[PDB]
Design a protein around this nucleic acid. Structure first.
Lengths: 84, 362
RNA sequence: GUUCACCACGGUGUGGUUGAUGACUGGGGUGAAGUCGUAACAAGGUAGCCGUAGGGGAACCUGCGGCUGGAUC
RNA sequence: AUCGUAGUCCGGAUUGGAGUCUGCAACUCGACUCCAUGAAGUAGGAAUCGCUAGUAAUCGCGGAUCAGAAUGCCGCGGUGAAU
RNA sequence: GACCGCCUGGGGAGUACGGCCGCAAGGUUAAAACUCAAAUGAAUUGACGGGGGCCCGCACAAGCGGUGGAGCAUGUUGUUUAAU
RNA sequence: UUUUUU
RNA sequence: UUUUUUUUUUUUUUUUUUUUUUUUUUUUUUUUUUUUUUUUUUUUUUUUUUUUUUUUUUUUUUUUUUUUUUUUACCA
RNA sequence: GCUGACGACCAUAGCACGAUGGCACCACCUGAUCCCUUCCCGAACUCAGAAGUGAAACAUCGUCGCGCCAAUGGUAGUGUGGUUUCGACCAUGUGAGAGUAGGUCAUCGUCAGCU
RNA sequence: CGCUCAACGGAUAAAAGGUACUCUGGGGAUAACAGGCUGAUACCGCCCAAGAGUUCAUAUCGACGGCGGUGUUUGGCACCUCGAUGUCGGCUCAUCUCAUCCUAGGGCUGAAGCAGGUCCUAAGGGUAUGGCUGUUCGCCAUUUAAAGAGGUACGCGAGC
RNA sequence: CCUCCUAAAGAGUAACGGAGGAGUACGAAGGUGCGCUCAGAACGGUCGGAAAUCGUUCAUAGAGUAUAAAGGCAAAAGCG
RNA sequence: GGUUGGCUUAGAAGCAGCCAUCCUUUAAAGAAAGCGUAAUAGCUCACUAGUCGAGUCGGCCUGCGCGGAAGAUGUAACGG
C-alpha cells in the first residue's frame, strides 16, 4: 500500500426516494381530490380550484382541467383547476 | 568577527594572529595555560621590537581581558587569537595548526581556509529491510532528518522519508506466497522505490550520498540505484539503523567521510600532473607568488603545514628567501582573493621537496 | 664385497614448562576548584573495630559472637 | 472650644503658580515662604534590632562642617516608664 | 639460660598465580610490577567536641519600643551613561 | 526527634 | 496500515459539563547561614499539537493532520 | 381633463433626476374630552375636527443615466441514420446561452366624485 | 403500555471459540502458482535545455518539465484450470532475443601515446572456480579477453 | 431512517462512490385573532470599545425559521 | 575611426554577465551574428562596391509521404 494514501472516509448513506414532482400536467382532466404536485415547499402555489396540504401537496378541490400559469407580483408558478 | 568572512576583511595594523596548541582532555590540557602564556610572551616581545611599546601594551591588555575568563577544560585542538589595536576575537578550532605568531596587515586565516576547504556536505541513506531514512549531513553534524515537517518533501511525487516497507508480503496479503521465494525481489523493488525518493530529493540539491545498512541491503540498493555514480561511501558496520538518531548515524559514517576526503586529495594529483604536462604548473615560491598576486593562478596545492617566511614586496613582485612570517599564507590569500581555489594536500601525498604547486590560468 | 650388531643425523606422535601477544573483562595507581553522598576521627551525632553471614548506587547497613585499641557515667 | 472615627479638620509626598535670600551664577542641581493640589499610608510576611533607670520611649534646643545647603553626626536639657 | 615462632618503610597485598584442604562459603602457603617519601608509636602545647563541671555579658528569659509593609532623606549594589 | 558540606 | 488512548506551565501530571485553567517539582525575589544546602516566606507561569467547523462564547462540540502509547496486521 | 377605491398584468410596468397639482379628492395638518392606543411614547392605531400647506408623501408629465426587455445572423449542444483517426464529421430535423443592432419612463377593466 | 428485537421484515425466552488430528458436499460462481487482459509502477529510449564540465548547454552528465517503446519489476482484474496446471533453489540438458559483456568494424571525444568515455553497426563464436548462506541474489577471495541483460509454465521433478 | 450529488431537465436507478444529519424537542415552540419586520453598513451619542443600549439614513432578506441539508417562506412559514 | 562604450571582473578589449545603442569617414560596416583567446590576438558574418546575368526569397495553410521505430520456437504488423 506503499504511499500511505488509502484510508477511512466513511460516507455510504443516502435516504430513500420520495417520488415528488408533477403528477397531473397542464390541460389534463382532473377529479376532485386528485394530487397534482408533490413538492418540498411551494415550488408551485395553489390557485383557484386547488388546495394545499400540510406537506405542500397540491390537490384538486373540484373537477375540471389542470392549468399551470405564472402570475402575481412575485412571478410565482401557480396551478389552477379550471371548470372545463 | 568570529568568521572567515570577517577576518579576511578586517585589515588592521598591526594585526596579530596567535595560535596555541590546546587539548580536549585532562591532564593533556594542563599545559594549555603555559602554552598560551608563552605565545603571548613572544607576541609581546615581537610587538615591542617591531612597533612601539604603547601599541604592544594596548593589544596585550585587550588579549588578556578576553583570555582571563577562558576555560581550558573546554579547549579544542587549536586556540586562535586575532588581536588588533581595538578588537580581539578568539576562536577554538578542531584543526591542528603549528603554534606561531603572525604580525601583518591581515589576520592569518589559512587554517580557517583549510577547514572550510575540507567541508563535505552529503546525504546519508539509512537502509533496513523494514524502513529507509534520509539525513542531510555537513561534515560531522546533521543538517536535517527529512521527516514529516520539512519543505523538501512538500511537493513530492514519491514516498516521503522516513519510508516504511509496507509491502503486501510484509503485511501478509496481496497475492503472494512465501513458498514462491519472492522476498529478494520484493526487497529489490522496495529499495528501488527508496532510490526513487532519494533521486527526487537529490535533484533539488545534488550532493554525494553515503549508503548505510546491512551488506546485503547495500548490495541490493547499489544494483537498483538510478545514479550509482553519485555514491561515494558505503558503511555496513553502523549500529541501530532504525532507532538510533541522526547524530549517531553521522558519527558512524565519519571514517568513510574521511576516506572520501583522502580519495579526493589523491585525485588532485592527477590534475596537478595534467597541469604539469600542459605547462601550466608553477612550483617555485617566487613564480607561485607572482602568479597568485597577478591573478594568474586558479588552483593552489599546499602541503598542509608548509609555513615559510620570506621578503615580499608588491612593487617588483620579488620573493627572496629569509620579512613576512607566512609567505605561503600570503600566496593563499592572493589566490583566494583573485577567485581561485586552495587545496591543502596531505603530507604522504605531496612531497616535502616540492610542498607548494599552482595550477595557473595561463 | 655382503650381512647382522652398536650408533650420529634426521623424522613421527603425544605431553610438560615458559616468553611475547589477544576482543573483552577485574582490581590497583596517578591526574584538575567534577557528580553523589558523609562512613571514620569528639559519645563524629547509631561507640568504634575483628570474624562471619545476609543486604544495599556508594561510602556502608543489619544479625550473631568477640575486643577495648570506648566518652559519659 | 471644636473635630467624633472618616482615608477624615489624619497624613503632607507629588505637581502648578508667585516670591525671598546666599552666591559671578539656583536649568541640570539650593534652602526656605505663600496659595492651590492632596499620593501612598488604617499598624505592616518570613524574619529581625535596641534598651536594666533618670535608662527606654517621647519632646524640643544648640554646635562642627558651612556664602547658601541636615531627616546625618556631635551634644543639651524637659517629661519619664515596664520588667 | 634452653628451644621454637615471627619482623625488616607505607601502599599494592594477606592480593595474584601454582599447590594443598574444603560440599560450598572459603581457608592455608604466598609473590611481582608499579607507586609514594613518607607511613607509624608515645608523649607535649593548643584548638575543637551534637564530652563533663563551674561561671559571666540586654546572651536568653521577663518586658518596653522598634526594623521588615507606605512616602521621603541618605549610603551601597545593579543597571545606565561620555562620565555616572 | 531532626545540625549535610566547606 | 487498522481499532482504541491520548497530546495543556520548565517537567510530570489534574480539569472541563461551551461560559474558568490545576497540583508537584521547578524558576525568580526574600529570609535564616561565615557561606552553600535544607528550610521558611513571596511571586511568575499556560495560542490547552495544529487545522478547518458549530456556537454569542470551545482547551472542551464536530472534522482533518500530526506526535504518543498500545493492539493487530492472517491463509496459501 | 383630473382624483380616489378595487382589479387585470407583474420592470418595455422598475429606479434615478426635474417640473406641475390643492377648486373636489388625497395627503400632511389641529387637538387628545370621549372610543380606542403605547411592554414608555396620540410615533403608529383611534376618535373629534378644519387654522395652515402642497414642504414631505402621493399622482401626473418629461428623459435613456441605470435597470429591464431584445432581434437577425452565426456559434454551441442535440433526436434519427451513417462514418470516425473518438477530437469529431456527413445527411436530415431542431437549435441555445452569451453578445450585437434595437426597444422601453407601460397597457387595460369596473365604480364613484369635481370639471 | 412493555424492544440499541440497531444484523433495525424482527430465526430462540435463552448462546463463545479451536482444529497443523481432522472430515463430507460443492466451486475455477472465488483466492494462493503459472497463462491471459492492462501497463499505474518499473525498466529502456527519445524531446526541451537550467545547469555542471576552470571557458564551453549538447566530450561526458542532464535540474524543471514533456513523449514514447517493452512486458520486464511492483501491481490491478478474476477470463482459463479446484472430477488436481506440483512451489523456491541446485543438477542435467538446453533454445531463442538483443537493450552487446568479450572478440570484430566505426563516428565523436575534455582522442598526444598507452588506456579509456560515449554512441552507431554487429548475435559468429565465447562468456570462471571457490568461501558463506536452502538460497536466486548478494558480499568476499582468486582469476579471465570477457565473467552480458533477458524470454522460454520466473525453460527443464512422467529427467534427477 | 432523513438531505444533497452521482441520477443522463417526469418518476425510479448501483458501487467498501463523494458529502452531511437522525433514534429528538415543544401544553407552547400547538389553535386563533390582532399586530410587527430582519442582517448588516454609515453618521451622532456617558461610561462604551471593532462590537451592548439610543437616534437617523440606506437596506427582497446579504437575517430568521428548535435542529442536517435541500426546497420554500411578505397573505410571511420569520417576530410579539 | 572615437573605442579596450560604461560597469563588473583575475581578466571581461564586438563576442561571461549587467546598463545604453551614440557619433564620425562613408558606397558600407552591429558599441556586433558566430568561431576563437585566460584576456588580447586571429578567422568569418551582417553590410557595401565590383563580376556574372533572370527570375528569386521566406513565412502561412492543406493532401500524401520520411525519421523517431529494440524481443524472445519461424518469415510472422496485407490470410498468402
Amino acid at each position: 500500500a506503499h504511499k500511505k494514501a488509502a484510508g477511512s472516509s466513511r460516507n455510504g448513506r443516502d435516504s430513500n426516494p420520495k417520488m415528488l414532482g408533477v403528477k397531473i400536467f397542464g390541460g389534463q382532466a382532473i377529479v376532485a381530490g386528485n394530487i397534482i404536485v408533490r413538492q418540498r415547499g411551494t415550488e408551485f402555489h395553489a390557485g383557484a380550484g386547488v388546495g394545499m396540504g400540510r406537506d405542500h401537496t397540491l390537490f384538486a378541490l373540484n373537477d375540471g382541467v389542470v392549468k399551470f400559469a405564472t402570475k402575481g407580483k412575485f412571478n410565482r408558478r401557480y396551478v389552477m383547476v379550471e371548470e372545463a | 568577527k568570529a568568521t572567515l568572512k570577517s577576518l579576511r576583511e578586517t585589515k588592521a595594523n598591526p594585526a596579530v594572529s596567535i595560535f596555541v596548541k590546546t587539548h580536549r582532555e585532562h591532564p593533556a590540557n594542563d599545559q594549555d595555560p603555559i602554552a598560551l602564556k608563552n605565545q603571548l610572551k613572544i607576541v609581546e616581545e615581537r610587538l615591542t621590537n617591531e612597533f612601539d611599546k604603547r601599541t604592544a601594551t594596548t593589544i596585550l591588555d585587550k588579549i588578556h581581558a578576553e583570555t582571563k575568563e577562558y576555560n581550558h577544560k573546554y579547549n579544542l585542538d587549536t586556540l586562535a587569537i586575532f588581536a588588533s589595536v581595538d578588537d580581539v576575537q578568539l576562536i577554538r578550532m578542531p584543526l591542528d595548526t603549528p603554534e606561531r605568531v603572525v604580525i601583518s596587515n591581515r589576520f592569518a586565516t589559512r587554517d580557517l581556509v583549510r577547514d572550510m576547504a575540507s567541508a563535505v556536505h552529503y546525504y546519508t541513506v539509512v537502509l533496513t529491510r523494514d524502513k529507509a531514512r534520509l539525513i542531510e549531513a555537513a561534515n560531522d553534524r546533521v543538517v536535517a532528518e527529512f521527516d514529516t515537517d520539512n519543505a523538501k518533501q512538500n511537493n513530492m511525487e514519491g514516498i516521503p522519508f522516513p519510508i516504511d516497507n509496507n509491502g503486501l508480503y510484509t503485511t501478509g496479503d496481496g497475492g503472494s506466497d512465501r513458498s514462491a521465494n519472492n522476498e529478494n525481489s520484493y526487497l529489490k523493488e522496495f529499495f528501488n522505490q527508496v532510490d526513487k525518493s532519494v533521486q527526487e530529493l537529490w535533484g533539488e540539491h545534488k550532493m554525494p550520498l553515503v549508503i548505510v545498512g546491512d551488506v546485503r541491503n547495500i548490495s541490493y540498493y547499489k544494483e537498483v540505484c538510478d545514479r550509482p555514480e553519485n555514491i561515494i561511501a558505503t558503511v555496513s558496520n553502523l549500529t541501530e539503523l532504525e532507532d538510533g538518531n541522526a547524530q549517531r548515524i553521522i558519527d558512524g559514517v565519519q571514517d568513510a567521510v574521511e576516506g572520501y576526503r583522502t580519495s579526493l586529495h589523491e585525485a588532485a594529483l592527477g590534475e596537478i600532473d595534467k597541469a604539469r604536462g600542459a605547462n601550466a604548473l608553477s612550483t617555485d615560491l617566487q613564480d607561485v607568488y607572482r602568479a597568485a598576486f597577478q591573478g594568474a593562478g586558479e588552483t593552489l596545492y599546499v602541503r598542509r603545514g608548509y609555513i615559510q617566511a620570506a621578503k615580499v614586496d608588491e612593487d617588483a613582485q620579488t620573493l627572496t628567501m629569509a620579512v613576512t612570517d607566512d609567505a605561503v599564507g600570503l600566496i593563499i590569500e592572493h589566490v583566494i582573493n583573485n577567485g581561485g581555489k586552495a587545496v591543502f594536500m596531505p603530507q604522504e601525498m605531496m612531497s616535502a621537496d616540492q610542498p607548494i604547486a599552482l595550477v595557473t590560468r595561463y
